Design an enzyme around this catalytic site. Structure first.
Site, mmCIF file in Angstrom:
data_model
loop_
_atom_site.group_PDB
_atom_site.id
_atom_site.type_symbol
_atom_site.label_atom_id
_atom_site.label_comp_id
_atom_site.label_asym_id
_atom_site.label_seq_id
_atom_site.Cartn_x
_atom_site.Cartn_y
_atom_site.Cartn_z
ATOM 1 C CG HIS A 10 -0.392 0.188 2.499
ATOM 2 N ND1 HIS A 10 -0.318 -0.836 3.419
ATOM 3 C CD2 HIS A 10 0.202 1.258 3.080
ATOM 4 C CE1 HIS A 10 0.300 -0.407 4.508
ATOM 5 N NE2 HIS A 10 0.625 0.860 4.329
ATOM 6 C CG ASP B 93 -0.180 -3.961 2.917
ATOM 7 O OD1 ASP B 93 0.092 -3.383 1.842
ATOM 8 O OD2 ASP B 93 -0.142 -3.389 4.022
ATOM 9 C CB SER C 33 3.073 1.669 6.282
ATOM 10 O OG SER C 33 1.809 1.849 6.891
ATOM 11 N N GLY C 34 5.281 -0.653 6.160
ATOM 12 C CA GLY C 34 6.394 -1.294 5.477
ATOM 13 C C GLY C 34 7.526 -1.625 6.430
#
Length: 228
Positions: free
Chosen positions: A41, A89, A183-184
């Site tokens: 994402h 994801d 995120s990630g």
């Protein structure tokens, strides 16, 4: 990272900043000499749109001997990832060239056997995501230690209401949690990468909403096949 602390500079030599047009967009983890793992994402929405990855960094803005920006040859999102879901994801990014390894840059071993992390295990998550609810972001890398929350409890209606699949995992997020821009990022247990931060948050630190991390072991087959 909320309820955290500045990390020791370059003590996490696997840590990546995934960057869009010269700005930190997402966390990432160097898993092979020419491959960084992140969230799908982070890229969905598109780009047009220069993606790069900063390695050997602690401070995003300040000069450091070990800092090195890599262009990206190919972005491989997990083909079953969708822009409206938290499922599958994951994003793999091949660097323009194999990374120069050193004390401040080193790939991290990740988990290949598909078993759950024992609930209660303290895992380490680091990132340059926002540190408060007012939305301020750190210049240097933050980290925090979080206990793994059992999936059953994480699936209770008050929390995530049955959404946490066997491919996902949870960590406690009571004042301490990963936020927007984390995120990630990597969730690391006993020196091994177990989790990748999915889409969260900005609603950061609500104990009634635990942090969700994609289990890397669930996508061992996929990661290998892309890496070969």
């Amino acid at each position: 990272i909320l309820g955290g602390r500045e990390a020791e500079a370059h003590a996490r030599p696997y840590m990546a900043s995934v960057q869009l047009n010269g700005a930190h967009l997402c966390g990432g983890v160097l898993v092979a000499e020419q491959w960084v793992l992140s969230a799908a994402h982070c890229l969905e929405d598109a780009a047009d749109g220069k993606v790069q990855v900063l390695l050997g960094a602690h401070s995003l803005s300040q000069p450091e001997p070990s800092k090195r920006l890599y262009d990206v040859l190919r972005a491989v999102p997990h083909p079953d990832s969708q822009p409206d879901t938290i499922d599958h994801d994951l994003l793999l990014l091949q660097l323009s060239e194999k990374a120069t390894l050193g004390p401040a840059v080193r790939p991290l071993p990740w988990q290949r056997v598909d078993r759950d992390v024992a609930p209660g295990t303290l895992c380490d998550v680091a990132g340059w995501g926002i540190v408060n609810h007012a939305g301020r972001r750190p210049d240097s890398l933050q980290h925090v230690l979080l206990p793994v929350l059992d999936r059953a409890t994480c699936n209770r209606r008050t929390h995530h209401d049955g959404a946490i699949t066997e491919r996902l995992m949870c960590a406690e997020s009571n004042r301490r949690d990963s936020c927007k821009g984390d995120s990630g990022g990597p969730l690391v247990c006993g020196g091994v990468l177990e989790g990748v931060v999915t889409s969260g948050s900005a609603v950061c630190g609500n104990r009634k909403k635990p942090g969700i991390y994609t289990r890397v072991a669930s996508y061992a087959a996929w990661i290998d096949s892309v890496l070969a």
